[PDB]
Amino acid sequence: SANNPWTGFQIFLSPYYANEVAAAAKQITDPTLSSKAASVANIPTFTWLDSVAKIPDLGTYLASASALGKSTGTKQLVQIVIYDLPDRDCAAKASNGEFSIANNGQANYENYIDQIVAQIQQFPDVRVVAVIEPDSLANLVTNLNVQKCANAKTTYLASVNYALTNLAKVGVYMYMDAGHAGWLGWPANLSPAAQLFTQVWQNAGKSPFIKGLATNVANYNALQAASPDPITQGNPNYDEIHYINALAPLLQQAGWDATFIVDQGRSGVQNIRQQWGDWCNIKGAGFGTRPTTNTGSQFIDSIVWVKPGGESAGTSNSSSPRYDSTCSLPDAAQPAPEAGTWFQAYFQTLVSAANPPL
Ligand SMILES: *[C@@H]1O[C@H](CO)[C@@H](O)[C@H](O)[C@H]1NC(C)=O
After folding, report:
1. Which residue among 8, 151, 165, 313 is least crowded, i.e. fewest CB within 10 A of its CB?
2. Which residues, in sequence order, are CB contacts of 328 under 8 Å at separation 6+?
3. Where is this chain compositionally biased, Polar residues type (predicted)?
């Protein structure tokens, strides 16, 4: 499109990830690998607003970015993920997230959005790009047979609508999460997905700030695979570029000339999964293509690193109350610590296996 949110802006580097990376790199004993690892702190990532507790951090990042821009003559851009739906991650094998539909979820989520808007409102010289609710709307395409998802459907739609509608009022550029090629990219899932995303876009007023969709968030697919990963058999859309090429025209027909961003943060190593749906701490993953607006496609505004690599996605301990058995599969790195905590060995392999090399 004419207006790529990233062009002309300097991406604010997460200091939280930078601190995690610095602490991680000093523990890497091989000096050559340690230096490569340290350099990861210079690669832009998205900040996940996974709870209300993260909102004060957002405020600090907006204010810091504003000052860095003035000190360097640049216009700054802060990258965030909105990730706090009630009954979050409805198809996952364990509940997570501070809000529940049964305890005033809608009002509490609205207040979470309101607090985010109240921060963003104060820093108009900083641009914000937001990924809207990973692991939400895609479940409403393929997973309505999952009772928790069926029961969450109206809340997910209302809450995502509230986020889109209110973040647009402060000029946030938004990409709704849209799963990945092995989820919504199956040819038979394209049209139901397009229908859902278009209805969501319509309900939020077709705001021009709703730029399009984010794909492969927190996943491992290739953008453009050299050859199809065996996990993809049966799906002609075996990588993200095939998925995006197939979905984009369906959105265009609705009057939404949508554009896309694609996570490649953990896509450096292909052919590492037994089944396509295996999502947790996949062993042997490497950092992938660095963020860039040189995307190879009319439809793609940026390759991005949405999920920061090194933070565990779930414990492998089957005794944890938060245990999801996906995290103990033969292709999951084990032992793995609780979700959100640093996973040092996984990070070191992400660095070692980076492609292109760090
Ligand atoms: C596994 O889970 C139980 C309870 O959640 C805990 O007591 C135990 O120490 C955990 N073991 C590891 C290695 O995390």
Report:
1. 8
2. 316, 318, 334
3. 314-328
The residue contributing the CA closest to ligand 1 atom 13 is: 317
**Taking the mean position of all CA atoms in its chain, how far away is CA 84?**
13
* Bond into 335 cis (ω within 30): yes
Ligand 1: residue of 316, 317, 324, 343 to mutate (most ligand atoms within 8 A of CB) is: 317
- Compute, in angstroms, the gap from residue 316 CA to the centroid of ligand 1: 10
Residue 344 Cα to ligand 1 midpoint, Å, equals 18
Spatial neighbors of 206 by CB under 8 A, at least 6 apart, are: 255, 256
Q: Which residues does 26 contact at the CB level (< 8 Å), separation at least 6?
A: 34
263, two tokens: 């996570």
CA of 93 to the centre of ligand 1 (A): 18
Which ligand 1 atom sits nearest the alpha carbon of residue 335?
13
As a whole number of angstroms, the distance between CA 302 and CA 292 comes to 6
Which residue among 315, 319, 327 is best mutated to probe the pocket of ligand 1, counting the most ligand atoms within 8 A of its Cβ? Answer: 319
DSSP-derived 3-state class of residue 175:
strand
Residues 113-136, buried b or exposed e (16+ Cβ, 10 A)? Answer: bebbbebbeebeebbbbbbbbbbb
Technique used by the depositors: X-ray
Q: Between the CA of residue 39 and those of 17, 34, 337, 342, 349, what are the distances in Å? A: 12, 9, 24, 17, 15
Pocket of ligand 1 (CB under 6 A): 317, 319-320
Distance CA 308, CA 231 (A): 24
The atom of ligand 1 lying closest to the CA of 337 is 14
Residue nearest to atom 5 of ligand 1 (CA): 320
Q: At what angle do helices 344-352 and 31-39 cross, to 10 degrees?
A: 90
C-alpha–C-alpha distance, residues 272 and 229, integer Å = 9
